[PDB]
């Protein structure tokens, strides 16, 4: 059933045995039984084999052991019984084996240890007791063992350690007690453990720093974390000089002694986080083997200048969330690699601060108040790969010896507007720059976060030559025909009717829109091929604000004056005394256009979204601050006069419309309003586009029709008027008569 190794070794795995195997050679040396179904051990089960050395009973459910069953095994060395179903430590059947070496009792639900247990074992060296349900340390059975080396009691339910627990263990080397529920430690609990090297107390509920550790003279590695320790008194580590590793994290530490960490001749790393009230740098005299130093969350304001004159082998350095104001020189250091200084009050950089660090790779100085950086700062600094400096008021950024850089982030430095030289950064992989136009110099595989897409072009503002000539065309004739029509309507020395003065104001508003378009065309013509250079200055200056205000103002006056024109016509027909009434209404509407245009100016960043200074296209996120409001006002008005004119259609018949000159005026107004409706639908649709997730159009296209479909009325309204109202011809003859009389 079980194979024979030939060297006196017998192995049994999952062969369904409920009793001890028999018939094997009496000279076998090692016996393993695992995964079978033995539940009880009969008396004199192992009397057959007198030369057994190592004994494995793994995984089966043994529950009862006869006291005399284990007798006769005087040479047994290793005994393993884990994951079985014993409930108490077998004080009997164990006293016989004098020459036992290692004993493993894991995963067995054990609650009580008999007093006379572990008696007669004179040379036991390893004893494993974890994952059980122990509730108090077996002081007497432990004292019974004088030659124990390694002790593990983990995951048990111990609550407190009484005094003089481990007096008689002279040669104990390592002690593991983690995940227990210890909360109090006596001052003399650990006496006698002179040769203890490793001490583990993790995840316990310690509420105050223990003192008994000062009795240990040769404690190498010490680990406690996730506890509730909050205060580190000075002189704590005085007793034990040699400490390679100190584990502490997740503790809610508040105060740490000035001289606590002093005179540790062999400590390797030091980490302190969350210690808020500590405000003065620790005294590190005598510690000359510190690879890594980390202090976070404190109130430190200054740094000693002998720091790495002492620390000759420091490799990394991080100091963030402090109140550091000035930086002492780091010239002495040679092995320093990574430096992090964030959320501090640094405001200037000097040449000498970073001089002499040969092997510095990663440098971070983010979220500070630095505004002055010397040109020669970074000049003789060695090969540096990743440099991050952002969210600081910075005016000019030098570049000397940065050719080896790979990662460079500068975002939030709105004061920085100078372009970036492409030749210097030869091996740059990832950029972050505050304004998208700067990346146009690289024209990128370089990665620049800012989108620098169509809405923010590099070479031409208007893009296509056809679009350029088209806007040039409507600009011109809008201007010329608007001037002609206003001269015809106003220069005549005749009484001015309400409708005539109304169309005059229409002409004035359309003229304003036209020279807004003209100023845009002038900018495009001037900045041909090099828009990237001028973009930042143009958007930041007041010109963009002026242009946007002009456009917005021109577009509201036209709409409101048209609405007032068609109710003027409606009630004029109806009374067929409101002339002065409507004149000041027109004035009041002009004032409203003025204030509506100037309202966004007091806000921040509303007019700088696009180089065109028109907010209605918006962008990635215009987040409808007032765009939705404006389109709502425009649509509601249009539907109002749509209803008004439908009512007029119902009231007055078509034959009277054909035979009435006032109705010819009505037809002209109807043409005007219909044109205004269809030419304003597209911009409203574009503003509604981001609200719907399904619809998406390329910035190429939305820019083109936003450019084309905005100013058309300023062009066709005067053309419509002169082409289809002989009223203009009559005024033309009148002004010809006046000119002939003058000349």
């Amino acid at each position, epitope marked *: 059933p079980c194979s024979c190794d030939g060297d006196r070794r017998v192995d049994c795995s999952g062969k369904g045995l409920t009793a001890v195997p028999e018939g094997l050679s009496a000279f076998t040396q090692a016996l393993d039984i695992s995964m079978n179904n033995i539940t009880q051990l009969p008396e004199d089960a192992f009397a057959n084999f007198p030369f057994l050395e190592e004994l494995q009973l793994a995984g089966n459910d043994l529950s009862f052991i006869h006291p005399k069953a284990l007798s006769g095994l005087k040479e047994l060395k290793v005994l393993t019984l884990q*994951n079985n179903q014993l409930k108490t430590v077998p004080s009997e059947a164990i006293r016989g084996l004098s020459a036992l070496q290692s004993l493993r009792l894991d995963a067995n639900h054990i609650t009580s240890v008999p007093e006379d247990s572990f008696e007669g074992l004179v040379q036991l060296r390893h004893l494993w007791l974890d994952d059980n349900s122990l509730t108090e340390v077996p002081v007497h059975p432990l004292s019974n063992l004088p030659t124990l080396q390694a002790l593990t009691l983990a995951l048990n339910k111990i609550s407190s350690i009484p005094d003089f627990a481990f007096t008689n263990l002279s040669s104990l080397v390592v002690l593991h007690l983690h995940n227990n529920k210890i909360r109090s430690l006596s001052q003399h609990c650990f006496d006698g453990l002179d040769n203890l090297e490793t001490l583990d107390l993790n995840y316990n509920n310690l509420g105050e720093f223990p003192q008994a550790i000062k009795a240990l003279p040769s404690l190498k590695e010490l680990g406690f974390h996730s506890n509730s320790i909050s205060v580190i008194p000075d002189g704590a580590f005085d007793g034990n000089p040699l400490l390679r590793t100190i584990h502490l994290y997740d503790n809610p530490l508040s105060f740490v002694g000035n001289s606590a960490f002093h005179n540790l001749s062999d400590l390797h790393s030091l980490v302190i986080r969350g210690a808020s009230m500590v405000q003065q740098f620790p005294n590190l005299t005598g510690t000359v083997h510190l690879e890594s130093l980390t202090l976070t969350g404190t109130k430190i304001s200054s740094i000693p200048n002998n720091l790495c004159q002492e620390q000759k082998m420091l490799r990394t350095l991080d100091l963030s969330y402090n109140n550091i104001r000035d930086l002492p020189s780091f010239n002495g250091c040679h092995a320093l690699e990574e430096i992090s200084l964030q959320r501090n009050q640094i405001y200037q950089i000097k040449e000498g601060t970073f001089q002499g660090l040969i092997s510095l790779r990663i440098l971070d100085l983010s979220r500070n108040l630095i505004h002055e950086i010397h040109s020669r700062a970074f000049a003789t600094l060695g090969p540096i790969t990743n440099l991050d400096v952002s969210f600081n008021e910075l005016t000019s950024f030098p570049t000397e010896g940065l050719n080896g850089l790979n990662q460079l982030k500068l975002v939030g430095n709105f004061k920085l507007k100078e372009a970036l030289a492409a030749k210097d950064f030869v091996n740059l992989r990832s950029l972050s720059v505050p304004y998208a136009y700067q990346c146009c110099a690289f024209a990128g595989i370089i990665h620049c976060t800012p989108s620098t897409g169509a809405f923010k072009p590099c070479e031409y503002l208007l893009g296509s030559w056809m679009i350029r000539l088209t806007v040039w065309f409507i600009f011109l004739v809008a201007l010329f025909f608007n001037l002609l029509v206003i001269l015809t309507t106003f220069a005549s020395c005749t009484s001015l009717p309400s409708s005539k003065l109304f169309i005059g104001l229409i002409s004035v508003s359309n003229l304003f829109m036209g020279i807004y378009t003209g100023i845009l065309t002038f900018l495009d013509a001037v900045s041909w091929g090099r828009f990237a250079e001028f973009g930042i200055w143009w958007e930041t200056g007041s010109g963009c604000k002026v242009a946007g205000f002009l456009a917005v103002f021109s577009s509201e006056s036209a709409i409101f004056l048209l609405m007032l024109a068609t109710v003027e016509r409606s009630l004029s027909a109806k009374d067929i005394n409101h002339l002065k009434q409507f004149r000041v209404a027109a004035l009041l509407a002009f004032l409203g256009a003025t204030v509506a245009g100037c309202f966004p100016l007091f806000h921040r960043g509303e007019y700088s979204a696009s180089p065109l200074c028109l907010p209605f296209p918006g962008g990635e996120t215009p987040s409808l601050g007032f765009t939705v409001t404006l389109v709502l006002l425009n649509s509601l008005a249009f539907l109002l006069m749509a209803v008004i004119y439908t009512k007029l259609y119902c009231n007055l018949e078509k034959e009277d419309l054909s035979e009435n000159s006032q109705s010819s005026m009505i037809k002209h107004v109807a043409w005007l309003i219909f044109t205004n409706c269809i030419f304003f639908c597209p911009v409203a649709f574009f503003s509604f586009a981001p609200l719907i997730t399904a619809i998406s159009i390329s910035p190429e296209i939305m820019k083109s029709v936003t450019l084309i479909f905005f100013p058309l009325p300023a062009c066709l309204n005067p053309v419509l008027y002169v082409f289809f109202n002989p009223k203009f011809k009559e005024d033309w003859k009148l002004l010809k008569r006046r000119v002939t009389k003058k000349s």
Partner: nanobody, 122 residues
Framework: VALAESGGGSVAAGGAIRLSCTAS????????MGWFRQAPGAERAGVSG?????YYADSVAGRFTISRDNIANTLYLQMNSLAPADTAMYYC????????????????????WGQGTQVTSA
């Protein structure tokens, strides 16, 4: 004390592989073990580890299983659907103190190291 590993070799992409490590001794803490990956020209990195919620690396998430059997004191790591970037040398590391997940991205804490194996994926 002594650590030994078995497994490894050359496998076409998308295969499955099992790596088994055995340990002998008593000083090590059975609640801190890890598998470490090394590619030439770079320092060791921690692929996976057992802590007391196993710690898994960013990259190998969803394709790597780590298990421990204290019945026979063996550590198992099974991989499936490998990518060629997984071709490297593998180590088993055991500590002397209990450890958390935060201790696994720094190898210097671990002390007991194995001889290692080599696995290549095509």
């Amino acid at each position: 004390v002594a650590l030994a590993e078995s497994g490894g070799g050359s496998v076409a992409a998308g295969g499955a592989i099992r790596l088994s490590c055995t340990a002998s001794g008593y000083t090590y803490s059975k609640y801190c073990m890890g598998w470490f990956r090394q590619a030439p020209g770079a320092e060791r990195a921690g692929v996976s580890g057992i802590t007391t919620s196993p710690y898994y690396a960013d990259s190998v998430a969803g394709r790597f299983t780590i298990s421990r059997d204290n019945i026979a004191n063996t550590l198992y790591l099974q991989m499936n659907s490998l990518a060629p970037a997984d071709t490297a040398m593998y180590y088993c590391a055991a500590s002397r103190l209990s450890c958390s997940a935060a201790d696994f991205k720094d190898f210097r804490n671990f002390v007991y190291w194995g001889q290692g194996t080599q696995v290549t994926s095509a």
